[PDB]
């Protein structure tokens, strides 16, 4: 994938950060490698690359390697918004805008 340069530091076994805990979880006993390099010329455009989306809110702390493919509207408050965008009811994806 593509993430912000600082956010690369969040991806690590058992580490912290919004991406590291709500988009993908790396178990502390992780075996493998993580390879990140700049590709600003490859992808980013003057109008901004908005083709990349990331989750910022999730109900539960992610299991290792567990992915939730669907993008249902998150609920945090007193009342459910039944999938409607509104106050305290947001879409679970945000665009980087590169």
């Amino acid at each position: 994938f593509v993430i912000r340069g600082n956010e690369v530091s969040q991806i690590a076994p058992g580490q912290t950060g919004n991406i590291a805990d709500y988009n993908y979880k790396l178990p502390d006993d992780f075996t493998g490698c993580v390879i990140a390099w700049n590709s600003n010329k490859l992808d980013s455009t003057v109008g901004g690359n908005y083709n990349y989306r990331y989750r910022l809110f999730r109900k539960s702390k992610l299991k290792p390697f567990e992915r939730d493919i669907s993008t249902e509207i998150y609920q945090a408050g007193n009342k459910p918004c039944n999938g409607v965008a509104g106050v305290n009811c947001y879409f679970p994806l945000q665009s980087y805008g590169f």
Epitope: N6, N18, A76, N88, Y90, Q94, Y96, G97
Partner: antibody, heavy 114, light 108 residues
Framework: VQLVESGGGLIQPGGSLRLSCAAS????????MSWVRQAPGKGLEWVSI???????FYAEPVQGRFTVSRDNSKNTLFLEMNSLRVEDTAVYYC??????????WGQGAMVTVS | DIQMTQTPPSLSASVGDRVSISCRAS??????LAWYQQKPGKAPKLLIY???SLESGVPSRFSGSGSGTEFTLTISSLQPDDVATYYC?????????FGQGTKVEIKR
């Protein structure tokens, strides 16, 4: 890091303002920045956030009215308030947002709309 | 919505005394609550975030605890640096909700 804000003053209802806040000691295009107003006699109200990527996230009341931006060369956050209302009066603070939250608070600019 | 209430609004304690203040949300927030200290004419300073993590720099005498609905800050011993107003903020990526404020003064 020091956040120094200016533009605090009086403005007529429905007018336009541009509050400024220079950030010193860090590069503004490398950190999240935020606008948070505190009305006289009220707690805080975080009104907007500009990411280091230029991704502007405005609160729904300020969506379509206020314009958050940063001058990386001047390393200064700017807020273009447009279609001002009576409720828009507060001590407005630029701030630095992070993974942990708001760590660097600006001295604030008074904003009176009347 | 999500409203947090702080108690006691009028507390007079002395330096060395504990200051036990309680901020309760109407429903469960889980862990997104932060304790702040603000003085009149000053901006609030984040004392604790996630209701259990000691914020870097704030004295360890402040012991914030709690989850879901209820939370409590405990100043183990009051000191003159602790004579100020205390707020609880529900954490949200957007506007969110703040506490009403527990103003702590020197008892006399």
């Amino acid at each position: 890091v020091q956040l120094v804000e200016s533009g605090g003053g009086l403005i007529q209802p429905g007018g336009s303002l541009r509050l400024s806040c220079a950030a010193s000691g860090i590069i503004v295009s490398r950190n999240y920045m935020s606008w948070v107003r505190q009305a006289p006699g009220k707690g805080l109200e975080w009104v907007s956030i500009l990411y280091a990527g230029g991704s502007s996230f405005y609160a729904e009341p300020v969506q379509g009215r206020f314009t958050v931006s940063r001058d990386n060369s001047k390393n200064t956050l700017f807020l273009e308030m447009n279609s001002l209302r009576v409720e828009d009066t507060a001590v407005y603070y630029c701030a630095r947002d992070l993974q942990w939250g708001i760590d660097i608070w600006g001295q604030g600019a008074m904003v009176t709309v009347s | 919505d999500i409203q947090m209430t702080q108690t006691p609004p009028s507390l007079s304690a002395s330096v060395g005394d504990r200051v036990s203040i309680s901020c309760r949300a109407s429903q469960s927030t889980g862990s997104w609550l932060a304790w702040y200290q603000q003085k009149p004419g000053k901006a609030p300073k984040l004392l604790i975030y996630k209701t259990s993590s000691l914020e870097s720099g704030v004295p360890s005498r402040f012991s914030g605890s709690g989850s879901g609905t209820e939370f409590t800050l405990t100043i183990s011993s009051l000191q003159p640096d602790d004579v100020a107003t205390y707020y609880c903020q529900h954490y949200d990526t957007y506007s969110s909700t703040f506490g009403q404020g527990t103003k702590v003064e020197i008892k006399r």
